[PDB]
Amino acid sequence: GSMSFSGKYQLQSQENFEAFMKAIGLPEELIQKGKDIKGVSEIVQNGKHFKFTITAGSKVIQNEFTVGEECELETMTGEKVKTVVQLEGDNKLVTTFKNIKSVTELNGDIITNTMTLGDIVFKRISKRI
Known part of the structure; x- marks a missing residue:
């Protein structure tokens, strides 16, 4: 195995961003x-x-x-x-939080992140520069 897990990505699209803030209680x-x-x-x-x-x-x-x-x-x-x-596959990262289940995956130039807070779950999308 020999891959380059060192790059840069700029935010592209997001779903209910402020929702994640309201879940924590942000103004x-x-x-x-x-x-x-x-x-x-x-x-x-x-x-x-x-x-x-x-x-x-x-x-x-x-x-x-x-x-x-x-x-x-x-x-x-x-x-x-x-x-x-945790790693499972050829390009899959699985990590958990104190009490937050997060699932990381690699799909082309799009990265899908999973997060659950305040019963609110949102996904994040980002393209390669």
């Missing part, structure tokens, strides 16, 4: 702010350990995660949750 100010900010997520890969980046309004976060083992990353709510990254 329109933050929703209107985030909506004014492009949601770009960079993926870093290095043998096995992959580096992640969070652009919550320019600000960036440096953290390293390893697959096969569950790690704990401090969310944006100042909380520490233990997430796990």
Whole structure:
């Protein structure tokens, strides 16, 4: 196995974005702010350990995660949750949250993310640049 899991993707289409904020209890100010900010997520890969980046309004976060083992990353709510990254297939990533089931898959240049919050589930679509 030898693939390049290090690229860049720019937000394209989204479904009920503010819904995800209302689920957590976010005002329109933050929703209107985030909506004014492009949601770009960079993926870093290095043998096995992959580096992640969070652009919550320019600000960036440096953290390293390893697959096969569950790690704990401090969310944006100042909380520490233990997430796990599972692989099943040739291009499929399965990870779970403290109490959120997330399913990652690879389909061409479109990435479908699954998240359930406040009984509200939405999918995200992003094209390759």
